[PDB]
């Protein structure tokens, strides 16, 4: 478990000016502090920290990784390849655990939503509708953090089962906003919080498809 | 006085002709609209979804073509897949630069 | 049909020549700390505006 913190400073003249003009300045700084805490938690979950020995979901050494041909190459689309790779990932989840666990959720980059909406030839429905018909009980969603998984510009897809016994995140303590400490003519307000990260108890229930 | 067609900060997409020498191509039209609808969502990071589309009145025949081996047209499929968006026709879109160029507004 | 496909408003006076609107922004960060620490980072804010005729 870890601890997070920041602070902000404000003087008395700024307080008077904010009260006079009707646009207070302390509330904006408090909002910035809260946003910084939340964004740090998100960054810890999706990128990790090498010095702190925090490992991201993409860098776990015991999860299944599948190299894939591009779903979009030379500005043309390949829905067939996408469907084949999705079915292969679901089959991998089913096989590697020997039927004990089954895939439930898929996360894809939001820029690949156009590939799965193409109408199949000589019919009135798209690839996504057929896939959902043949794979009842699976949800599909788009996540922005999947637009870059290594810092170099490659994409990826996550197939997993969302159960509390497989993975978890803990937030033992919430944002608190400690009292203010006066000085000569200004103040200082510190803020703290607590978090753990992503804990993966069963690493065989996650498949990452790279090169998408 | 900047217009809706000359503003340098709006999104602009060049495209192949929807009707190239009397050859109507409804497949390209069906792919150019979803791209714009996705662009509006992408560049604003949410908080703004496309609602209205304006097309020249001379191009309603492209969206009325019946898709091969089916009993429905491209317009019905587009409305089924993109429910919540209204399509209207505007005569001002048949000339956007004085040289006969046509345009579509999303 | 310029007045039917676009919104129209009257929040303007007949004797006005210009108008302006404002926008705001913020910066900040956070870190992982120990218990006996007194070097927490800071945050700030700013703004700007644009005009008309």
């Amino acid at each position: 478990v870890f601890r997070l913190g920041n602070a902000y400073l404000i003087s008395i003249d700024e307080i008077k000016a904010g009260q006079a003009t009707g646009r207070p300045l302390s509330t904006r700084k408090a909002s910035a502090c809260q946003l910084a805490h939340d964004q740090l938690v998100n960054r810890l979950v999706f990128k990790g920290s090498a010095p702190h020995k925090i490992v991201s979901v993409f860098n776990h050494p015991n999860i299944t990784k599948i190299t894939s041909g591009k779903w979009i190459d030379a500005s043309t689309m390949k829905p067939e390849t996408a469907e084949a790779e999705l079915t292969q990932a679901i089959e991998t989840i089913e096989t590697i655990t020997r039927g004990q666990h089954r895939a439930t959720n898929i996360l894809i980059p939001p820029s690949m939503r156009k590939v799965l909406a193409i109408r199949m030839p000589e019919t009135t429905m798209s690839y996504l509708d057929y896939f959902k018909s043949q794979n009842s009980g699976i949800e599909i969603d788009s996540i922005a953090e999947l637009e870059d998984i290594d810092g170099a510009g490659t994409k990826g897809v996550l197939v997993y089962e969302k159960n509390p016994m497989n993975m978890s995140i803990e937030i033992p303590e919430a944002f608190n906003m400690l009292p203010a400490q006066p000085k000569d003519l200004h103040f200082k307000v510190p803020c703290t919080s607590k978090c753990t990260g992503l804990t993966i108890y069963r690493p065989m229930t996650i498949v990452l498809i790279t090169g998408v | 006085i900047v217009s809706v067609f000359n503003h340098p900060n709006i999104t602009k997409i060049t495209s192949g002709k929807w009707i190239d020498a009397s050859t109507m191509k409804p497949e390209t039209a069906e792919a150019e609209l979803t791209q714009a609808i996705e662009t509006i969502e992408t560049i604003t990071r949410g908080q703004h979804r496309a609602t209205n589309i304006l097309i020249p009145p001379s191009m309603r025949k492209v969206l009325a073509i019946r898709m091969p081996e089916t009993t429905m047209s491209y317009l019905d499929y587009f409305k089924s897949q993109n429910s919540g968006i209204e399509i209207d026709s505007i005569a001002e879109l048949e000339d956007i630069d004085g040289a006969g160029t046509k345009g579509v507004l999303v | 049909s310029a007045l039917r496909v676009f919104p129209v408003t009257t929040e303007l006076s007949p004797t006005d020549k210009t108008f302006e609107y404002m926008t705001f922004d913020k910066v900040g960060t956070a870190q992982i700390i120990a218990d006996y620490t007194d070097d927490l980072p800071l945050v700030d804010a700013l703004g700007t505006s644009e005009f008309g005729k």
């Binding site: 946003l35 939340d38 999706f46 | 990071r45 | 302006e20 609107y21 404002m22 926008t23 705001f24």
Partner: peptide, 27 residues
């Protein structure tokens, strides 16, 4: 020398009621 008018700019200027804020979605 200065050759100006009786009315200044701010007397014929309006501020819109609604402002805008930048968006930073958390995640």
């Amino acid at each position: 020398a200065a050759t100006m008018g009786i009315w200044t700019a701010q007397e014929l200027h309006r501020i819109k009621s609604q402002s805008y804020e930048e968006d930073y979605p958390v995640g």
